[PDB]
């Protein structure tokens, strides 16, 4: 609070009232400290569940069916593309994995927007659409099918200037 000097610092080193949170928030344009806390809490929960299902005896059909259930569930979600290992879940599931599974990273991935923050702005303006329905919150993890089926909303100025640069406007579809 005052950038304490040497003797009062060695007297009171521990008092503080106010960094992977801000790290992924800056490199990955996440919204909230609590968004990171939720994702990290989630990852710790998953690791605890891995502990518990491993504590369940390995020669158990219940254990194997619930294990493969979690495996292909998180795969069809998208947080892991492999299905084979168990070390892939005990190690590779990250806040960065779920963060690249987040929507504006996928928009920036498919180059919908040049930048992830402009992707977020397009999300706020609703100039996008996710399969059947459009979207407005960036805090969205997209299933792989909707990742294949996400695009701009129709009759949007952004898609219209896409077709204007490509000189392929079709006003029949109010494109």
């Amino acid at each position: 609070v005052r950038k304490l000097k040497h003797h009062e610092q060695k007297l009171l080193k521990k008092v503080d009232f106010l960094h992977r949170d801000t790290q992924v928030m800056r490199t990955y344009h996440i919204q909230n400290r609590e968004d990171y806390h939720k994702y990290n809490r989630i990852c710790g929960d998953i690791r605890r569940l891995a502990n518990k299902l491993s504590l369940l005896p390995p020669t158990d059909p219940f254990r194997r069916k619930h294990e493969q259930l979690l495996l292909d569930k998180l795969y069809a979600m998208g947080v892991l593309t492999t299905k084979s290992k168990i070390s892939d879940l005990e190690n590779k599931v990250t806040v960065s994995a779920i963060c690249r599974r987040r929507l504006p990273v996928i928009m920036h991935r498919l180059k919908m927007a040049e930048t992830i923050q402009d992707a977020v702005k397009f999300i706020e303006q609703g100039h996008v659409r996710v399969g059947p329905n459009l979207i407005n919150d960036p805090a969205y993890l997209v299933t792989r099918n909707m990742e294949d089926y996400v695009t701009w909303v129709d009759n949007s100025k952004i898609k219209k200037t896409l077709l204007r640069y490509r000189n392929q406007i079709d006003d029949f579809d109010f494109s």
Partner: peptide, 19 residues
């Protein structure tokens, strides 16, 4: 219209079809 809407209920393409 939504409370967290940034556009109008008119210019919203929310449910301009039938499901």
């Amino acid at each position: 219209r939504f409370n967290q809407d940034r556009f109008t209920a008119k210019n919203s393409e929310r449910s301009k079809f039938f499901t």
